[PDB]
Design a protein around this ligand. Structure first.
Ligand SMILES: [K+]
Lengths: 147, 144, 143
């Protein structure tokens, strides 16, 4: 079937917040990447893993995956930073509805308040003075029919 | 080769602690899911990933995977929450014996003290006012 | 091909990661070495390191080094408040042949601080038992 990895090496200032008002809309957080994938197989799943290096002053990080054409996220996850960079992750298994190429958008933002930096320290400076890499991968798998 | 994903969306208050006296028993934590998988290949392994949204007042979260029929966990992992929700994960490779369906239970609880809420804020409220989703997946693979 | 490499020892990771050593081989403490051989050409390895780590309040750094290189090919970040927490590295590396290749995983403090792997910050067993961190290599064919 399919495997696709999408590295994200850009630094992103995510000043877009996630709130109870915007969480089920398209307005929450800040987009950090877009990814187009095509299932090879009927009846398959995409196992999606976003593993994002992020910093913020003490608080929560929200990640939201949006299928282009939908009006709200199809998966939402949560991370944390104390001030120092931490891996913030989203895992989901999406049931595929055909063989049409589909574009997903990943958005990142503070839980209710605060600015989140992706691939940087909490002030936007390079972590350890270098370029860092976050990753979003899509792995197509066939789920087992359980007897 | 078998694959299955098991979403978990209930808000669950995990009052069961993990302690040095219960960690090698079936009594630690609070069960948050139970899953039955069937290997298609003999001598395979399951790559298991539990990714659980959890909150607790400042402290450690423990995750334990228990194979039904065993007397203690076959895998143990650790997570953290400051009070705000955070993903707490267990990732392991588990050996399969034969082709019969096998049932696994996932337990979550505080490291030695504290209450852990799964899929909720530390007071049991909905995170961002919505239903939230945790996942446990099993991917069958042939080891080298 | 799938290969899993469990790491069970209690390891004091006293080697720091600093701006001066991050792009060298000198950062961190090696916690494991893994030799894998791609079965298919054009393939990638999906690498997942999930390491139980503790330190006094602060950042944990993880670096994967491929034998022959002068610096890490993947770097990730974790956190501990003083109690053990899973610190992870995820990456996809492109395979270049069908010959065995050796990788090294190093863990250390972000700029300062001792990190313990598979242990409390004083080197005691967590919950009084042996604990397990894992590094796996799953060979897959890309698009
Ligand atoms: K903290």
């Amino acid at each position: 079937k399919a495997f696709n990895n999408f590295p994200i090496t850009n630094k992103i200032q995510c000043n877009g917040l996630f709130t109870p008002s915007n969480i089920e809309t398209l307005l929450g957080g800040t987009e950090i990447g877009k990814f187009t994938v095509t299932p090879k197989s009927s009846g398959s799943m995409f196992l999606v893993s976003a593993d994002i290096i992020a910093s913020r002053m003490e608080g929560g990080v929200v990640l939201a995956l949006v299928r282009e054409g939908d009006s709200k996220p199809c998966a939402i996850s949560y991370g944390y930073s104390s001030g120092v960079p931490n891996l913030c992750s989203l895992r989901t298994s999406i049931t595929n509805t055909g063989l049409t190429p589909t574009t997903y958008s990943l958005r990142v933002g503070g839980l209710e308040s605060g600015v989140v930096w992706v691939n940087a320290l909490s002030n936007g400076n390079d972590i350890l003075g270098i370029t860092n890499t976050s990753n979003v991968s899509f792995l197509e798998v066939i789920p087992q029919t359980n007897a």
